[PDB]
Amino acid sequence: SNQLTAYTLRLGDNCLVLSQRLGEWCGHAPELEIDLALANIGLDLLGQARNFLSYAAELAGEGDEDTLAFTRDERQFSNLLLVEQPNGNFADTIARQYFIDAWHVALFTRLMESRDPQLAAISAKAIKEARYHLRFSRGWLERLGNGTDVSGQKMQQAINKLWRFTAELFDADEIDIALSEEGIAVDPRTLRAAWEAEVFAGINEATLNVPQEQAYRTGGKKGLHTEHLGPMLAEMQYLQRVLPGQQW
Amino acid sequence: SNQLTAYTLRLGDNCLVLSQRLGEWCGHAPELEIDLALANIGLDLLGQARNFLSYAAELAGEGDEDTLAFTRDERQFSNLLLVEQPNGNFADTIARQYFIDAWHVALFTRLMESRDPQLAAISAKAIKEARYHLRFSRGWLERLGNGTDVSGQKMQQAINKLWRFTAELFDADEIDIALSEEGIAVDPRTLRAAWEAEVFAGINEATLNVPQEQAYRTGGKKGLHTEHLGPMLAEMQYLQRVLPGQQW
Amino acid sequence: MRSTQEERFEQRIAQETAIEPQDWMPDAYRKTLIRQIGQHAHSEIVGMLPEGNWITRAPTLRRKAILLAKVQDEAGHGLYLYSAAETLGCAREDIYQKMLDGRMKYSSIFNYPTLSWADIGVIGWLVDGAAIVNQVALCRTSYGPYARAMVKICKEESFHQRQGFEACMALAQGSEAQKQMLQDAINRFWWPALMMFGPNDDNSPNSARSLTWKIKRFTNDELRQRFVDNTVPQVEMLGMTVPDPDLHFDTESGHYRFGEIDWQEFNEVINGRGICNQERLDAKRKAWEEGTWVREAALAHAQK
Amino acid sequence: MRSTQEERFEQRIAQETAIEPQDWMPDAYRKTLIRQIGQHAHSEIVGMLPEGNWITRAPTLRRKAILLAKVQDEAGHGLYLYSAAETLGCAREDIYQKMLDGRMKYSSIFNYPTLSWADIGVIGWLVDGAAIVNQVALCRTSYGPYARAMVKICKEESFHQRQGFEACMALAQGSEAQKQMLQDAINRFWWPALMMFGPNDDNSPNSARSLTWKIKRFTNDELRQRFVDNTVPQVEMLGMTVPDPDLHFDTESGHYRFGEIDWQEFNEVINGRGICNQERLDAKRKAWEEGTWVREAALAHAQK
Ligand SMILES: CC(C)(COP(=O)(O)OP(=O)(O)OC[C@H]1O[C@@H](n2cnc3c(N)ncnc32)[C@H](O)[C@@H]1OP(=O)(O)O)[C@@H](O)C(=O)NCCC(=O)NCCSC(=O)c1ccccc1
Numbered sequence A, B: 001s002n003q004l005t006a007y008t009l010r011l012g013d014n015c016l017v018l019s020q021r022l023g024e025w026c027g028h029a030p031e032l033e034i035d036l037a038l039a040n041i042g043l044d045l046l047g048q049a050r051n052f053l054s055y056a057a058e059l060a061g062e063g064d065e066d067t068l069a070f071t072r073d074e075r076q077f078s079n080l081l082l083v084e085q086p087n088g089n090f091a092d093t094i095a096r097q098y099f100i101d102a103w104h105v106a107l108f109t110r111l112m113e114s115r116d117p118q119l120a121a122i123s124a125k126a127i128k129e130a131r132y133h134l135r136f137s138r139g140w141l142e143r144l145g146n147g148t149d150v151s152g153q154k155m156q157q158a159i160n161k162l163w164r165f166t167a168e169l170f171d172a173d174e175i176d177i178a179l180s181e182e183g184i185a186v187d188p189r190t191l192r193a194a195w196e197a198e199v200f201a202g203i204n205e206a207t208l209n210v211p212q213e214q215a216y217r218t219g220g221k222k223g224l225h226t227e228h229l230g231p232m233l234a235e236m237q238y239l240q241r242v243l244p245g246q247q248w
Numbered sequence C, D: 001m002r003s004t005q006e007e008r009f010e011q012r013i014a015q016e017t018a019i020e021p022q023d024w025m026p027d028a029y030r031k032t033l034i035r036q037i038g039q040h041a042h043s044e045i046v047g048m049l050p051e052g053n054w055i056t057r058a059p060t061l062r063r064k065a066i067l068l069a070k071v072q073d074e075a076g077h078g079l080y081l082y083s084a085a086e087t088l089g090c091a092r093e094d095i096y097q098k099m100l101d102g103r104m105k106y107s108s109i110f111n112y113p114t115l116s117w118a119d120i121g122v123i124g125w126l127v128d129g130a131a132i133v134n135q136v137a138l139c140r141t142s143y144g145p146y147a148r149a150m151v152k153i154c155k156e157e158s159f160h161q162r163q164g165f166e167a168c169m170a171l172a173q174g175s176e177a178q179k180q181m182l183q184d185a186i187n188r189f190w191w192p193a194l195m196m197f198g199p200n201d202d203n204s205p206n207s208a209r210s211l212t213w214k215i216k217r218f219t220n221d222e223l224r225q226r227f228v229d230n231t232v233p234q235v236e237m238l239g240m241t242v243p244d245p246d247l248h249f250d251t252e253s254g255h256y257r258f259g260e261i262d263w264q265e266f267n268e269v270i271n272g273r274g275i276c277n278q279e280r281l282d283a284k285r286k287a288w289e290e291g292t293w294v295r296e297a298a299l300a301h302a303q304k
C-alpha cells in the first residue's frame, strides 16, 4: 500500500507544482487569450492534483489533499524536477509545458488500463485534459519556433535549458517497477518511444533542434529537488503554516 | 509606552525589511566588490533592526527580536513602503538605497539627541553606518547618472519609479508628534529640508532631474502595505512558521 | 429642430427597441458607449490582478481551484466586452493602449491591494456583488450588444459571487483569527465597493445623456442604495460589522441610511493616485511590452 | 642537465625559501598555480551561492546576521585569491571568464543544493572544516603570495566554521524535527565534503609535480584522513551519525578507517554534470551579463 501511495502522490505532486507555476502567469501573459489558456491549464492540473492527492490520503488512511499539499516540506515533495522550473519567458513556460503534456498524454493513455480502478478512473479524466494541453503547448512550440528569428532563438534556448530534466520522465525506481509488474503502474522507461516520437516530431516541425546533451538530472521523485522548490512551498504554504488546522 | 514601542518598531522594521531586500542580491551583483558592499550594508541594517526590535520587545515587556520579526503578519509590519520595493535592476536598488540613506543620516543625526537614552545610543551607533551607506549609494547615483547614456536613462527611470513613496519619509502621525513633543522622537516633517538638500544636490550632480510628480504614497507605518510585503514575509518567516517556538 | 435621423433615434429609445450595430446613433451616444463598454472591458482585465495576487497563496486546494476559475471567467468577460465595444467601430488594440497610457479608466476598486486571504473572499462577495447590481441593471441598457453581454456575464458571475460569500462564511464560522481577518478585509473594502457605483447623482457628468438614452436605467445613487439594502443583511449573517457609524435603518423610508463617501479619495483614485494605480498599470504595461515578441511570432507564423 | 635557472629553482624549493612574484619559476609551476589559485578564488565566488540561497530564509536574526557576515567574508577571500593569482601574471577578468565558460573549475562541493536550514550549519561545519584542513596545510605552500593568502583566510574562516558548528549544536539539542533535519543534512553533505580534498593519491595527475615543488605539502588522502579523524568526534558530540557503514576505528593504526568514495559521482560533478552545476554557472553568467551596463557606467564615469 505504501508503494501505491508514493506512486499516486508523485503524480499528484507533478500536477500540484506545475499548476502553481501556471498560477503565477495570471494577468501577466502576452495576450488575454493566453492568460485565459494558462489559467485553464493550471486549473485542469490542480483538478488532477486534488484527485491524485485525495486518493493518496485515502490510501494512507489519514489526512487529505490539504494536509498533503500544505504540511509536507521540500524533502517529502515528490514532483518531477521539470515542473518546479521557473516560468522564465514565454518560451521557457511553453517548453516546460510541452515536455510535460507529451508525457501526460503518453502516461495517462496507459494508466487508464491500470489494474487499480481509482488510478484508472483518475487517468481517464486526466487524459481528456492532457490532450487539450498538448494541442496548446505544441501549437505554441510551432508558433514560436517557426515565427520570427527572435522567437525561433528563444524557443531553442528554452528547449536546451530544460533538456537535462527530461531524463526523470523515463527514470524507474523500485516503486515504479514493483507496481508496474502488478499491472498497476506504468514503468516510465516504456514511455520513451511515445514521448520521443511526439517531442522529436514537434521540435522538427517547429524547425528546431533536438538537444544533443544527454539528459542527466533526476531526484525530484525522491524528494531531492533543485533550489527552486523550497521558495515555492514557502509561498504556497504560508497561510496554512501560520494558521494550521482550520477550515477555509 | 505603547507609542514609544510603535515608534521604535517602525525604525526596526524599516531596517529589517530593507536588509531582507539586500540579502537577495548576494552572489548576483555586477561585481564582486558590489556583492561585498551590498552584503555589508544589509548586515549593518540587520544589526540596527536587531537593536530597535530588541528595544521594542523590552518596552512591550514580552517577546524578542525573533518573535517580532517572525510572528507578525503584513498588517502589523510598520516599515516604510520604500524599503519593501523590489530590487529591480541595479539602479532601482541604488535609488531605493540613496533615498533611505539620506533619510537615515538626517534622522539618526537628530535621534542621537533623543531624551530616550536607549534610542539615543542605538542612533549613535546607527549614524556611523548610515554615513558609510550614503557614501556608497550617492557614489553609485553619480556613477550611473553620469556614466553612459544607457546608465543615465536607467538611473532616471529608477528615481522616477520610487519617487511617490518618498512622501512617507516626512509623514507625521500622532505617535510621531506626541513623542517629538516630549523630545523623544524626531518629527519626520522637520527632516525634509535636510533630506531635500542632500537628495536634490546628489540628483543634480548625477546630471539627473528631480521628479516633478508630487509624492503621494503612505500607509506602511500603519501596516497598510503594497502587495510586495506579503510574499517577502512568506519567504522570511517560513521556517519559524513551520517549526515555531524553537532555539536556532 | 432635430434631424429626422435624430428624431427617429429618440423614438426608438422611447419604445425600447434595442439599438444594434447597423442602426444610426448620435455620435455622442456611440462615443459614450465606446467609453463605457471599453472601460467595463478594461476593468475585467485589471481586475484579474488583485485576486490573481493570491492564486499562489490560497489556503486550500478547493479555494485555489475556485479562484482560478473565477479569474479565468474575468478574462472571458473582458473578451465579451471588447467584442461588444468593437461593434461600435472601435478597435480593441486601440482602446487597450489607451488603458495602458492612462487615457481610459478602469474600475476604481482594482486600485486597492489584497493584504490577506480574507480580501479575496470579500472581493468575491462585496465587489462582485456591487458589479452584479450594476450589471443586472444594465441588462435593459438600450444598446443590444451591451445588454446581451450583461446577461451572459451576470449568468456566470453570480455563481462566483456566491462562492466568495461562502469563503467569507468559512472565516466567519472559523477561529478568532479568521474572524478578525474577515472583519479587517471588510473594513478596508466596504467603502471602495460603494464607490464602484460612481459619483453622486449631483456630480455625475454622464448621467443626463445616459439616462435620456436609456444607457443607464437607474441612477448611480439608486443602485448604490439597493446594494446597501441588499448587502447589510449579508454582513449580519456573517456576524460582522460595517465601518460606518452613520449606517442605520430608517423605518420611515424602508432603506438603510448610510454615511458620506470620501469623494476626495474617490477623485484621487480615478485620477491615478490611489494605492495600487501605478502597480496595476505597470503590471499590464510589462505584460504587453514583454509579450511583444510572442505576438509578433504569432503574426509572423500565421502568414507563413 | 637542468639549466642553471631550473637547478637554482629546485634548490630554493628544497631549502624552503618562499618563491616570490619576481623570481624565476618553471613555466609549468607558474601555470599550475594560476590553475590552482584561480580555481581556489573561483570557489569562493561560486561558494556564496549555496549559503546565499538561505540568507532570506534563516530562522533567527542572529543566524541570519552570522550568515551574511560569512558570505561577505567569502567574497573578501575571493578578492585575496584573485590578487594572489594576478602576481603570477594572469588577469582576474580572463580567469573569471574561463570560470563562466566552464574552462576552469571551482570546488565540487558547491554543486550541491541547500534543501534545508540545517544544510547551512552543516556547510559552515563540515565544508569550511574541510577547506580549513586543506588551507592550513597550504600555509607553507612554496609560493609566498599563496601561503600568505592562506594565513589571512584561515584566520577569518575558522571563526565562521565554529559558528556553523554551533548552529548544528542548536539543532542537535533542539526538537526531534530539528535533530532529524540535522541528520539529513549530514547524510547529504558528508561524502561531498570528503571529495573536497580531491581524488585518491593513485589518481591525482597534479600531485607528482605539486608535491615535488612543495605546492602541495600533504597528499589528498593524507588531508582527507586527518579531516575524518578530526571530524568524527565532532559528529559524536552532536549525537549524530555518518552515512558510512564501513566507518570504524582501527586501534592498530590510530585512524578512523572509512568507506570508499563514489568516484563516478565525483567525476560527473567536476565535469559539469552534478546537481547544481548548470544553475551555479547560470547564476554567475546572469550576474555578469546583467551587470555589464553597470561596469561600463563605472568605466565611463571614471574617465570623465
Ligand atoms: C456607473 C459607472 C461606473 C459610472 O457612470 P458614468 O455615467 O459612466 O460616469 P459618471 O459621469 O457617473 O462619472 C464621472 C467619471 O468618473 C468615471 N467613474 C465613475 N465611477 C467610477 C469608478 N468606480 N471607477 C472608475 N471610474 C469611475 C466615469 O467613467 C466618468 O469618467 P469618464 O467620462 O469615463 O472619463 C458606469 O460607467 C458603468 O456602469 N460602467 C459599467 C460598469 C463597469 O465598468 N463595471 C466594472 C466592472 S467590475 C469587473 O469588471 C470585475 C468585478 C469583480 C472581479 C473582476 C472584475
Ligand SMILES: CC(C)(COP(=O)(O)OP(=O)(O)OC[C@H]1O[C@@H](n2cnc3c(N)ncnc32)[C@H](O)[C@@H]1OP(=O)(O)O)[C@@H](O)C(=O)NCCC(=O)NCCSC(=O)c1ccccc1
Residues within 6 Å of the ligand: D035, D036, D039, D040, D041, D043, D044, D045, D047, D048, D074, D105, D106, D107, D108, D109, D127, D128, D131, D134, D195, D196, D197, D198, D199, D203, D204, D205, D206, D207, D210, D216, D220, D270
Ligand atoms: C586538493 C585540490 C582541490 C586538488 O588537487 P590538485 O593536485 O590541484 O588536482 P588533482 O590532480 O588532485 O585532481 C585532478 C583534477 O580534479 C580537480 N579537482 C580535484 N578535486 C576537486 C574538487 N573537489 N572540486 C573541483 N575540482 C577538483 C583538480 O583541480 C584537477 O583538475 P585541473 O587540472 O585543475 O583541471 C587542490 O587544487 C587545492 O588544494 N586547491 C586549493 C583549495 C581549494 O580550491 N579550495 C576550495 C575553496 S573552499 C571555499 O572556497 C569555500 C568554503 C566554504 C564556504 C565558501 C567558500
